[PDB]
Design a protein around this ligand. Structure first.
Ligand code: VO4
Ligand code: VO4
Ligand code: PER
Ligand code: PER
Ligand code: PER
Ligand code: PER
Ligand code: CA
Ligand code: CA
Lengths: 590, 590
């Protein structure tokens, strides 16, 4: 037949495959309308558990006008630029300067303008490849009164309090007091100590973590994420440098071969440095209620974070948070791909032409080679992003962990001032008492450093980011959906079962890589899963995402990648499949 | 309609749009079957102008068996893995060790195995997004007897002899002798001094370079690649580093802000160094006829290049060749995108939600934002690569410039030994006498450095790469097609008319960036065109591509990118278009 007609039929067949996968219906947790305004004569929803950032908020963290959120949801579902622009973003504005009146003196002195919702209708964007953004569903997010939300918030608060603690010293006596504290309180939560009961949602069973130990503290549940050092090799270690190739029987060593162990990736003929920008240690954000409310009212605090000179390999929790702050969409997984390519990590052996050219007479660059995987790992990211944007904006609209910390802080402060507000976070306040007292101490320290000599007692979740979370709902996670999708692409494309012989940790003292004490075996699949773990949890340690957001959007990204892979497989006439270890432990052939 | 049905309809609509663009028929130059075996009783084609690398070659650079090339073409068209594996790749093999007998002692002592054709059938791969690999045509490649081929190989010979000459010193007296020589020889070629005649093919007229000066020597013809310094800003300069953002009225400065002028791209929270690995200066490859013939017989010389320790900003021509040797598919253009995103270069103003958030209430990350452009610039590359693989393997199969230099060298050596061979490169030999004599001197020097105390006189095109070209035909260029596609994506997505206030050159003495002497204005569109120029002509500086390969592959990539953009525009409900300045000076709205 015609080549153009064959191309049309291949594209139509891929669309038919995407359509025949069906639409998994996306269910919210019902929090949007279940929580009501505390005012006895006001029956409108409070929307406290809903992502209400940017809409004008009262002094307690709830929005003044529930209609303001209703218009926001309508604009989400419609996608119209005029309806988005007609939304009220930020607080009341000064008639003279045109600038919004901020609650905090910091945002008023900066003359901060409002920041807008980041692609509130990207979930309505169609996808030429892979699953449609609305064809796949994440499960309902945990509700505020759920023990899962309490466990997630405890994890977030402990990460915020443990931001300056280095990953290589999780078991070290120096951090033993904070590590044992975190382990004790997490294991004091019925989410961690008590297993899932029969009849619980399957995703609830899947994402439930057991007893928290130092070996799995702040770690994911992906296979290989809990095995070995905390940080993935691909997030800290470099790669085989230019010149370290083998030419027949002669093995030439790169003159820059030490750059592999100095965290430098062979990025073509130039280098990607794995060293992260050093955010100011101990400097958290939105620890003051006025600044937090301004951020909830869309105060653009982007770029307000201060940084130490130079760059170091990720050592502290805050370093991982900084890494996931600015990462260029697929940058973690593009870097992992570059490491695997430079290290000569073989592609999936079921890919064609992977044998030595003595046998197949065919090198692989464009298809089943470096270029194919490099393009796939990067094209999967925007598709996963569209799906997660649909999940964030049109389905769940889950409030950010900063907003949950705001509700918890205002609830804990209410008895002190004689009031009683936000009973939905009462379980979180009660079960996180000790974590909340140390959070209050840390917030008092930060707010004294902020400029308030005698700051009000604040239990807000300390934010690694000055703007806090990105300006979209937390559930799901764009970073974690891209993590799932790109790691799925890499595990399918590369021989993910390949064992990593050299396992490196960041040195406990110096800014360098040392051979990890891990005496086990680390696979490529395990380390890619650990890298997805690292990015998603680093979103958690910034305070911008809950754990369940990360795990479920990682699954969503894996689904996006699988759909894309099945659709592109229709484009190759070669007899081949991707051996793809899924996050659930099974392998799919694509 | 249903959302799933709407997704299917959008994908099938993009497929109909791709189908309705039609198929531009792909014409070769007729060189494949026009040159015949000089043996009188043998009437089979010589296939000398055909890409015959890998197929066994005689002592003069032609293939022993035309049936070998015929089977290679049949395997190209079929794409069958078995037929590709059944192809005779490399020379005769030792029955004892199983290794092929190499003509050169270098490849025999290395026990070199064969290297396969890189995606000989990737042009048969269908594309779910954008134009089909076979729906777009690049014009016929110039023939060996054409003055265009003589000009191309002269430019390539001139680049090889000037690989150690720095871009910031093109007009410097110490290189004035080599630059004036190159200018005089190029302007002595009727391709450069004589303009295109009426009735010539329009692509020939469009790609014909006129009078060669110091300010346009070794430069492209894209708009903006001829004004300003040689190297694009994005190939050498860094970008705004993390911490240098503007927060309301306060302008925080990054503690690492000097990294922008040190050639350090803010790659999320980590950095990309623009410094390229220093290939061994004065070390060229395939200068000896035996090593060249082994490479023609698929000798795997990859990684055989040597490097000095460290990395430096691109100064010499060999540095650009090294940069394009290993660049990860979209690396130059992904780096340019990262620079434009870190620098805060505004997106296309016709993109939606690009106003301040006070007006539009919407940030752009997933759609019309950093993630969108990153994913687009990375996904256009593999589609352009498929199109160029079709052009390389199924249509043109143009011999590599190393193979052109082989024919030229054997033709020049034949009268010395009393014979005569390859009269099709007689025009190249006659018109390039001075360049060929300097190439003979340089090749003799390199072959003495290789290990031959008294090497045979060789006029081979010196190769920046030990394997020389990648194992596919030169026409078109994968790097140039990716450059065209990705730079088109960046010019469409970003406000490409934005002027770059700061223009940097690599310092004439130190490995650093100085303020360029350019008193004119440089735009983002011009600098992206210059970056595509830099990559394509760096492939020329390697000696692996001719100029026409580069320019026509850049046009093909621009077509790929435009088709992808049209097909993606159907996926967005926003009222927007990409303002896209083409390589022909016109602007398309997408
Ligand atoms: O959805 V989030 O990347 O803020 O990771
Ligand atoms: O086709 V070439 O990238 O060898 O640029
Ligand atoms: O091939 O590249
Ligand atoms: O990040 O969002
Ligand atoms: O948004 O990211
Ligand atoms: O490179 O091809
Ligand atoms: Ca192979
Ligand atoms: Ca905007």
């Amino acid at each position: 037949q015609s080549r153009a007609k064959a191309s049309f039929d291949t594209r139509v067949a891929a669309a038919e495959l995407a359509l025949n996968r069906g639409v998994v219906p996306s269910f919210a947790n019902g929090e949007e309308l279940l929580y009501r305004n505390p005012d006895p004569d006001n029956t409108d929803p409070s929307f406290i558990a809903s992502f209400t950032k940017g809409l004008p908020h009262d002094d307690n963290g709830a929005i003044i006008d529930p209609d303001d959120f209703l218009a926001f949801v309508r604009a989400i579902n419609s996608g119209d630029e005029k309806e988005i622009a007609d939304l009220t973003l930020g607080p009341a504005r000064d008639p003279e300067t045109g600038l919004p009146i901020w609650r905090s003196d910091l945002a008023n002195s900066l003359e901060l303008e409002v920041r807008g919702w980041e692609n509130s209708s990207a979930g309505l964007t169609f996808d030429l490849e892979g699953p449609d953004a609305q064809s796949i569903a994440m499960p309902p997010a945990p509700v505020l009164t759920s023990p899962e939300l309490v466990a997630e918030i405890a994890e977030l608060y402990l990460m915020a309090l443990g931001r300056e603690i280095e990953f290589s010293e999780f078991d070290s006596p120096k951090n033993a007091e904070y590590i044992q504290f975190a382990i004790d309180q997490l294991n004091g939560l019925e989410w961690f100590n008590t297993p899932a009961k029969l009849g619980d949602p399957p995703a609830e069973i899947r994402r439930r973590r057991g007893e928290v130990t130092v070996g799995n503290l702040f770690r994911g549940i992906l296979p290989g994420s809990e095995v070995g050092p905390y940080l993935s090799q691909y997030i800290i270690v470099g790669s085989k440098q230019i010149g370290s190739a083998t030419v027949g029987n002669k093995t030439l060593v790169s003159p820059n071969a030490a750059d592999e162990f100095d965290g430098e990736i062979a990025y073509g003929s130039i280098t990607i440095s794995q060293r992260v920008r050093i955010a100011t240690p101990g400097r958290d954000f939105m620890t003051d209620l006025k600044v937090f409310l301004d951020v909830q009212d869309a105060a653009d605090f982007r770029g307000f974070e201060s940084y130490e000179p130079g760059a170091r390999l990720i050592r502290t929790i805050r370093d991982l948070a900084t890494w996931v702050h600015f990462d260029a969409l697929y940058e973690a997984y593009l870097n992992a791909c570059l490491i695997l390519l430079a290290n000569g990590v073989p592609f999936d052996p079921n890919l064609p032409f992977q044998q030595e050219d003595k046998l197949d007479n065919q090198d692989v660059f464009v298809n089943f080679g470096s270029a194919h995987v490099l393009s796939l790992v990067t094209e999967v990211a925007t598709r996963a992003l569209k799906a997660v944007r649909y999940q964030k904006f049109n389905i769940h609209r889950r409030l950010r962990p900063e907003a949950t910390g705001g509700l918890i802080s205002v609830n804990k402060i209410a008895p002190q001032k004689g009031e009683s507000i936000f009973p939905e976070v009462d379980l979180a306040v009660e079960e996180l008492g000790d974590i909340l007292e140390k959070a209050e101490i840390s917030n008092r320290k930060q707010n004294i450093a902020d400029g308030d000599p005698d700051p009000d007692p604040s239990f807000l979740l300390p934010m690694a980011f000055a703007e806090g979370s990105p300006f979209h709902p937390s559930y799901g996670s764009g970073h974690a959906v891209v993590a799932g999708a790109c790691v799925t692409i890499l595990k399918a494309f590369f021989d993910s079962g390949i064992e990593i012989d050299q396992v490196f940790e960041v040195d406990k003292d110096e800014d360098k890589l040392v051979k990890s004490s891990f005496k086990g075996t680390l696979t490529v699949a395990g380390e890619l899963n650990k890298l997805a773990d690292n990015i998603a949890i680093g979103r958690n340690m910034a305070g911008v995402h809950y754990f369940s957001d990360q795990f479920e959007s990682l699954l969503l990204g894996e689904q996006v990648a699988i759909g894309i892979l099945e659709e592109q497989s229709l484009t190759y006439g070669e007899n081949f499949f991707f051996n793809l270890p899924k996050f659930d432990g099974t392998t799919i052939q694509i």
